[PDB]
Amino acid sequence: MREIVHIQAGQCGNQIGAKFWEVISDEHGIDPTGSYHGDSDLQLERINVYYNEATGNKYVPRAILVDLEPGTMDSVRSGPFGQIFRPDNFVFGQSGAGNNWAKGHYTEGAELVDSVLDVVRKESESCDCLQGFQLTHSLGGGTGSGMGTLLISKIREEYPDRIMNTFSVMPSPKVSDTVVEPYNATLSVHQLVENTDETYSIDNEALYDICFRTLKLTTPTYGDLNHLVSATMSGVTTCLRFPGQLNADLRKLAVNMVPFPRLHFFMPGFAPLTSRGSQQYRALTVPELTQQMFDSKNMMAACDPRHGRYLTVAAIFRGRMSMKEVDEQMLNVQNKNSSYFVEWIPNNVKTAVCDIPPRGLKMSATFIGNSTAIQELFKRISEQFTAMFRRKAFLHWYTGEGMDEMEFTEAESNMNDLVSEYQQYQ
Amino acid sequence: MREIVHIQAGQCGNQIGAKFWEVISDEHGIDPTGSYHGDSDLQLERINVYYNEATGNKYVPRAILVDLEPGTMDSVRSGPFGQIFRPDNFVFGQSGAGNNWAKGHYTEGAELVDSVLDVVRKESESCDCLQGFQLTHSLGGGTGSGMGTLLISKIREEYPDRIMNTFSVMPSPKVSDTVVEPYNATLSVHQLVENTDETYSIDNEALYDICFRTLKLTTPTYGDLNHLVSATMSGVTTCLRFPGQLNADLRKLAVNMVPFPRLHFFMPGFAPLTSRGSQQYRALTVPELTQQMFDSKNMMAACDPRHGRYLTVAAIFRGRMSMKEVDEQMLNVQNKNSSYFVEWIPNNVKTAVCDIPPRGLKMSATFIGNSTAIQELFKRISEQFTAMFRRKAFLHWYTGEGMDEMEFTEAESNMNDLVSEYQQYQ
Amino acid sequence: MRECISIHVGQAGVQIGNACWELYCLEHGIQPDGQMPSDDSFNTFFSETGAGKHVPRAVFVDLEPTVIDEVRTGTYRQLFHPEQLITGKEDAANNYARGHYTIGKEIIDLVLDRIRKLADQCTGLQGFLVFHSFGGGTGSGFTSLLMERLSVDYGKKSKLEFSIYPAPQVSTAVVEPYNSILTTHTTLEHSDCAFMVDNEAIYDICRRNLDIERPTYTNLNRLISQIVSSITASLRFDGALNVDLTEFQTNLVPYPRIHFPLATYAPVISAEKAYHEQLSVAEITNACFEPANQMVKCDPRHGKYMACCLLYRGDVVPKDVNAAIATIKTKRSIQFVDWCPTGFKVGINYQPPTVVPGGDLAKVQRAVCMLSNTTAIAEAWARLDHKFDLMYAKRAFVHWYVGEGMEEGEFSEAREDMAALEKDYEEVGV
Amino acid sequence: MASSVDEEALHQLYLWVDNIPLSRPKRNLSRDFSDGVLVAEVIKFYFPKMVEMHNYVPANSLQQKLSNWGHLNRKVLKRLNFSVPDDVMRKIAQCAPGVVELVLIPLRQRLEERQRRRKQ
Numbered sequence A, B: 001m002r003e004i005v006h007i008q009a010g011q012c013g014n015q016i017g018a019k020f021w022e023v024i025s026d027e028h029g030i031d032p033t034g035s036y037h038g039d040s041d042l043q044l045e046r047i048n049v050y051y052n053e054a055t056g057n058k059y060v061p062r063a064i065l066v067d068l069e070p071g072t073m074d075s076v077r078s079g080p081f082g083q084i085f086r087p088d089n090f091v092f093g094q095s096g097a098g099n100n101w102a103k104g105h106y107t108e109g110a111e112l113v114d115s116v117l118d119v120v121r122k123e124s125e126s127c128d129c130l131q132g133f134q135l136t137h138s139l140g141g142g143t144g145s146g147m148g149t150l151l152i153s154k155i156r157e158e159y160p161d162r163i164m165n166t167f168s169v170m171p172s173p174k175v176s177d178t179v180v181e182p183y184n185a186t187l188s189v190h191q192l193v194e195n196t197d198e199t200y201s202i203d204n205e206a207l208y209d210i211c212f213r214t215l216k217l218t219t220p221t222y223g224d225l226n227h228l229v230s231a232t233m234s235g236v237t238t239c240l241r242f243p244g245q246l247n248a249d250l251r252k253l254a255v256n257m258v259p260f261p262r263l264h265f266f267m268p269g270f271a272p273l274t275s276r277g278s279q280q281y282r283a284l285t286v287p288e289l290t291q292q293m294f295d296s297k298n299m300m301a302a303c304d305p306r307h308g309r310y311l312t313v314a315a316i317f318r319g320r321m322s323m324k325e326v327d328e329q330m331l332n333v334q335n336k337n338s339s340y341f342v343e344w345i346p347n348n349v350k351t352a353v354c355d356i357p358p359r360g361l362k363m364s365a366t367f368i369g370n371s372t373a374i375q376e377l378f379k380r381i382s383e384q385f386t387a388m389f390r391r392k393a394f395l396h397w398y399t400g401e402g403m404d405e406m407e408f409t410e411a412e413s414n415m416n417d418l419v420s421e422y423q424q425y426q
Numbered sequence C: 001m002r003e004c005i006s007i008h009v010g011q012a013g014v015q016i017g018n019a020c021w022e023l024y025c026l027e028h029g030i031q032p033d034g035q036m037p038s039d040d041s042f043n044t045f046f047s048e049t050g051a052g053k054h055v056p057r058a059v060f061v062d063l064e065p066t067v068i069d070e071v072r073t074g075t076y077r078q079l080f081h082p083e084q085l086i087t088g089k090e091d092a093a094n095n096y097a098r099g100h101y102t103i104g105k106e107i108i109d110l111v112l113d114r115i116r117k118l119a120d121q122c123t124g125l126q127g128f129l130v131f132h133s134f135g136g137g138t139g140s141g142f143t144s145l146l147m148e149r150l151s152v153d154y155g156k157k158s159k160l161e162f163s164i165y166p167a168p169q170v171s172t173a174v175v176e177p178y179n180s181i182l183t184t185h186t187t188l189e190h191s192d193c194a195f196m197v198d199n200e201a202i203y204d205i206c207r208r209n210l211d212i213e214r215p216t217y218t219n220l221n222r223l224i225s226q227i228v229s230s231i232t233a234s235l236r237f238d239g240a241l242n243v244d245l246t247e248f249q250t251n252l253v254p255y256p257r258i259h260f261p262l263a264t265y266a267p268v269i270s271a272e273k274a275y276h277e278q279l280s281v282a283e284i285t286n287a288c289f290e291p292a293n294q295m296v297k298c299d300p301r302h303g304k305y306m307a308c309c310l311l312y313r314g315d316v317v318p319k320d321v322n323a324a325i326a327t328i329k330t331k332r333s334i335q336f337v338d339w340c341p342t343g344f345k346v347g348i349n350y351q352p353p354t355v356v357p358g359g360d361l362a363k364v365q366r367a368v369c370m371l372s373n374t375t376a377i378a379e380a381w382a383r384l385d386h387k388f389d390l391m392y393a394k395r396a397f398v399h400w401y402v403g404e405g406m407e408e409g410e411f412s413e414a415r416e417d418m419a420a421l422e423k424d425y426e427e428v429g430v
Numbered sequence D: 001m002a003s004s005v006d007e008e009a010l011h012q013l014y015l016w017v018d019n020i021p022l023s024r025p026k027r028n029l030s031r032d033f034s035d036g037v038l039v040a041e042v043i044k045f046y047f048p049k050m051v052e053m054h055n056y057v058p059a060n061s062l063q064q065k066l067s068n069w070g071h072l073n074r075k076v077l078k079r080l081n082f083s084v085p086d087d088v089m090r091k092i093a094q095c096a097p098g099v100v101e102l103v104l105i106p107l108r109q110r111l112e113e114r115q116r117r118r119k120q
């Protein structure tokens, strides 16, 4: 029943996916050993969406862990929930990609794509009614951006009709940790736009901005950014794992949220968000959730929505609430801020409400937005690419892998084409 | 059968009308919950005049409570008889008028006039044979004087033939509690003269004079002034709710009491009035009621009748009495004091007698008088207006509401015209 | 005798069914288990077996299981025939395209199979009461596929249409007008009398009349159920003037294409408010024509009445009905078309309204059901047509409809048809 | 020929509406026309048929004012081939001086246009 098959690519992808697995195992009440320990039967009916039923009433997640290094596999298996995973889905090479997209897409990951495909196919045939694939990866470096796009293309080729949603942490200028990120991002979005039905753009800088300027953490580590990602990870698929008054699965979002086929790079967000010493004072009412939700500080990318127009926004609310105030805020936001939403398309909001709130939360709101302002990251990536493209650096480490100049040129042309379409409707 | 529809405007109006409702509920023997508890059937035949018959033999008064603040509604509903009223006739705004006539007549009360009209119309269609509207309000401030005149004009426009009697407590120099009263009074009487068929002028100072110099109360509160008003409130409509030898309803008074159409601001009064320790000694005979009745101390305005001439006086007596002494006092008063009554109109008195006296009273007398001396309050209001008109104070708080100077000028001109007509026949 | 088969399509249809049958079991006195503790008043809606069990003649069809298998868990899990409540595997994705060609294709054949096995015990089948929502993918596509085959297999039988219609301001999906426009061919060609439901207008109703600040859709349902039961009141209970379901629709319909009447219910009033009013026949008659009581956000004072039907129930005397309608024709603010100086159809039933114990509606000795066609309702479509232009002008979301097997020009036929309907409802007003 | 509008045209227009017999009491025009129901009464004199007065209800809340004016835009103004934006309509409904008069000026001209037209 609407089974969803997860794939992890790169160290970023597999660690954030592992923490997502931890979060939704707590939501479904799954013991670290894999046994069920939840309180209500509501955690139990839609276990088949993320986990496989096995002997002893223990449940194994439908995740395929893919990497080119064994060290990340070693860390994840030794992590808090390493034991719950399938030993077979730990499919990995030995030599790393070295943050080389060409390595992952032609040499290093091409040999392991056969060993990942035979696992993803068995996972899919284990499903009763497959709905799609949620894939976690990073546009930075050559592992997540490199092999991730290749296997995404393969699964899209053999699964042409299933939903393809990807959550992509993507490079940024001021919190860049690797020199050669823009090549990787340009060569990755080239395949992401053509193949993926859904892509969530996540930028690390805005995660940092959330954890300082909203969460007031003095030392928010990398796991806290993983937590911020996993919150929306769990939120976007809430409707098809739990009952709610307005059920909106992934394709419910899709039919409402992407006006033209290529305009599918979106803006995630989550509410509520407070510091430790300020949650005691906050009124968690739904209107306040809304005023927090469309704030430019709550978002997870540097693209400020005030520099563009929203095409479609998705607000999947959660908890035991009525909904007239839901409609009134969703119309007030787009009425008083009608200059920030495309007036030519009147009702830019998709509303979904779930009946069971997250554990420890009385209510929650998950933000998904289509704004023309998201081109801020794309054109900046293209500009940084040009600053390292126009007269030939670092290309020997790609062309040595069989990579060629004209494909780089087409990738840049496609970035320019994308930013053109997203500026067209602004 | 001669149904009469009541409207309350302003805090003064709705509280004095509420105490009137209490008084006549006791007279008709109506339980605080609305059920009937009277002793004789005489209280029961003309219940339709003031109350609506409902299920369970309980009776709801035909009153429309209008205000611009919810606090007065809160007090009246929590008052002694708050529960008997209709929840629907509590029609009210949130922001007050701030004692601004322009606010009530243009901005604050204009939005609520639609919500009062749909209630007054349903109340009128609920009636079998409507006779008129008795409206309680205050000339002071901007709520009672402001919206009261507007809705009076509206009901006069759509009910052109019904009797329009208003009881108006009006500002005074020495017991003034608000700075901007004269503007309100001048802008209110402008509509009162043109629209109302009947207006009873009530002045607070003479109510105080009654409660000290006749009732000998050491601490007569505001509710005691409300009681003094409600006594004549109940008296003026006695004839069409109870049998009597001389039946004189509102239009019976009207045809006898206002010689020219605009000379309809009148002088209320009530007898007997004693202190607690002096009622034990008083002989309540009708001649003594008369000698008390035309006393300048018994009246409820500062206008001393010895400074003018009576045009018409109405003495609606009540109780099991014969009437030859009634005629003999009503002729002796106008014969021995013929210098205080217009000799050019010979019989200035209208006599009405009711058969059932008020509860606890063997007899009672209600005073209604048309004296040219009532211009004392009008010309004094005009003079105080001029002291704050001739060179422009406080007008920014009216002109900011769309109010204009020339309308103030016409209002003052109309006050002068009125005082001219009332001095003409003196 | 006098049986009616109720169809419930989409989440809105199945849940409004859950509320309707909740009302019906109470008013006819059936336990949630289907038994009768202790007249054939139930034969109109419920079938009887040998063991003394009342089995409803209803189908719950949803292309997704969540709401229906929630019904399989609720208090009415045993009331219904389990395999007459049909569930699909893939949701409709708020898309008319898949619901009309792709996903409903494999399930409709079972739906008509169950409809046939519901028809074959109905000896006096009167008509069909299908419930759905315009904006929903299932309620659009599957209903569009279903009335097509019902109109050729049960062409003679009347098909009443109770549909939930989008608000001028309140909306839950951006694709709702797309789903709504392709539904218009079904109501025009394969429906006999359609009843349109607006959520925002009835939101205002419950805000003002019921005094409840925070109702759910369940409160909406526990009044749509009353409106449908009041429409079916004459078929199930005795009355001085019982209106047949065919008599009803003959009185509504002036022309075969003009069959879209508004609905209002009176007295919609809270329990605290029922006490202080006598609640006469006249005021419930006057309250129905008040634009603040309309079920659809359109001003009747903006339009002209063609047919008026007074469906009273409870302790109402027809003389009071005549006295009320004399006043109704007395005022000029309610101007009827020059078609109907007779104006009013009167229907009186002896059963007082049945109150839901968990409901927000008061217990009143009298209830009236107002159903009227008017030209003012075209405004409820006069914003939807301009709305549909505002999306179709770029081909806003058509690649999904194109990708699921819809012809691109079907949108062109759709807005041509709505324009034809809008014109048709304007010439008759002269 | 005056290229622009002078202060005298306002007075001319003020007097003309009084010249028509309109079933209205003594009050300023700039606050009555704001309601909207007066405009259709004005046009009743010219063509009683097109005016229904079974469609707009007199109130004095801005919500009903704008709701009536919007209706009027698409049922009277459209017949006169006359179109106005909502930004303007807001101001008319606010009893804005000058704004509704800017529509009163061409309204009568359009009416006389319809008069001259040989309609069968």
Ligand SMILES: CC(=O)O[C@H]1C(=O)[C@@]2(C)[C@H]([C@H](OC(=O)c3ccccc3)[C@]3(O)C[C@H](OC(=O)[C@H](O)[C@@H](NC(=O)c4ccccc4)c4ccccc4)C(C)=C1C3(C)C)[C@]1(OC(C)=O)CO[C@@H]1C[C@@H]2O
Binding pocket: A022, A023, A026, A027, A224, A225, A227, A228, A230, A231, A232, A234, A235, A272, A273, A274, A275, A276, A279, A358, A359, A360, A361, A364
């Ligand atoms: C005592 C109290 O009220 O504290 C709350 C809490 O509400 C706060 C402090 C929580 C707290 O979260 C954090 O401190 C945090 C730190 C870094 C990154 C993200 C969160 C909380 O830890 C988080 C936790 O939230 C949950 O349990 C949700 O179900 C959440 N799951 C997790 O956060 C989680 C934590 C550890 C392991 C697995 C899951 C979730 C959210 C969306 C979708 C699915 C699950 C709650 C209620 C609290 C604490 C404990 C302090 C917040 O978290 C969430 C996700 O709601 C941070 O801002 C929100 C709201 C509050 O301020």
Ligand SMILES: CC(=O)O[C@H]1C(=O)[C@@]2(C)[C@H]([C@H](OC(=O)c3ccccc3)[C@]3(O)C[C@H](OC(=O)[C@H](O)[C@@H](NC(=O)c4ccccc4)c4ccccc4)C(C)=C1C3(C)C)[C@]1(OC(C)=O)CO[C@@H]1C[C@@H]2O
Binding pocket: B022, B023, B026, B027, B224, B225, B227, B228, B230, B231, B232, B234, B235, B272, B273, B274, B275, B276, B279, B358, B359, B360, B361, B364
């Ligand atoms: C023991 C005794 O004889 O006392 C009498 C009484 O006659 C006196 C003291 C009463 C008394 O009134 C007052 O004390 C009073 C105080 C402030 C303002 C007005 C009155 C009495 O309270 C008032 C009351 O009058 C009535 O009941 C009338 O029906 C009156 N209704 C009310 O006063 C009333 C009081 C409470 C609640 C509801 C109504 C009425 C008058 C005209 C039209 C309709 C109704 C009576 C006979 C008395 C007492 C009890 C002391 C007087 O009242 C009236 C209105 O007749 C004050 O002067 C008169 C005559 C007497 O002096």
Ligand SMILES: Nc1nc2c(ncn2[C@@H]2O[C@H](COP(=O)(O)OP(=O)(O)OP(=O)(O)O)[C@@H](O)[C@H]2O)c(=O)[nH]1
Binding pocket: C009, C010, C011, C012, C013, C015, C016, C063, C091, C092, C093, C094, C095, C132, C133, C134, C135, C136, C137, C138, C139, C140, C164, C165, C166, C171, C172, C173, C176, C197, C198, C199, C217, C218, C220, C221
């Ligand atoms: N009045 C009312 N309308 C409802 C209710 N439930 C759903 N709706 C309407 O249904 C519309 C959207 O349709 P959906 O919620 O998707 O339900 P559906 O018909 O099954 O469509 P799909 O989910 O795509 O299969 C909303 O715009 C609502 O107006 C309800 O309980 N009451």
Ligand SMILES: Nc1nc2c(ncn2[C@@H]2O[C@H](COP(=O)(O)OP(=O)(O)O)[C@@H](O)[C@H]2O)c(=O)[nH]1
Binding pocket: A009, A010, A011, A012, A013, A015, A097, A098, A099, A100, A138, A139, A140, A141, A142, A143, A144, A145, A169, A176, A177, A178, A203, A204, A207, A222, A223, A225, A226
């Ligand atoms: N938000 C987030 N970003 C990370 C995390 N870990 C690393 N990053 C950054 O994301 C980028 C992704 O590149 P990387 O995954 O190392 O390339 P790969 O090895 O080829 O997959 C790196 O440059 C890191 O700076 C994390 O846990 N959260």
Ligand SMILES: Nc1nc2c(ncn2[C@@H]2O[C@H](COP(=O)(O)OP(=O)(O)O)[C@@H](O)[C@H]2O)c(=O)[nH]1
Binding pocket: B009, B010, B011, B012, B013, B015, B097, B098, B099, B100, B138, B139, B140, B141, B142, B143, B144, B145, B169, B176, B177, B178, B203, B204, B207, B222, B223, B225, B226
């Ligand atoms: N006789 C009498 N006068 C009152 C009473 N309450 C207030 N007043 C006076 O009457 C005046 C009326 O003004 P007010 O009603 O407050 O203005 P509004 O709020 O605009 O209606 C006030 O200035 C008070 O001083 C009362 O109970 N009886």
Ligand SMILES: [Mg+2]
Binding pocket: C010, C011, C012, C062, C064, C092, C136, C137, C138
């Ligand atoms: Mg559905």
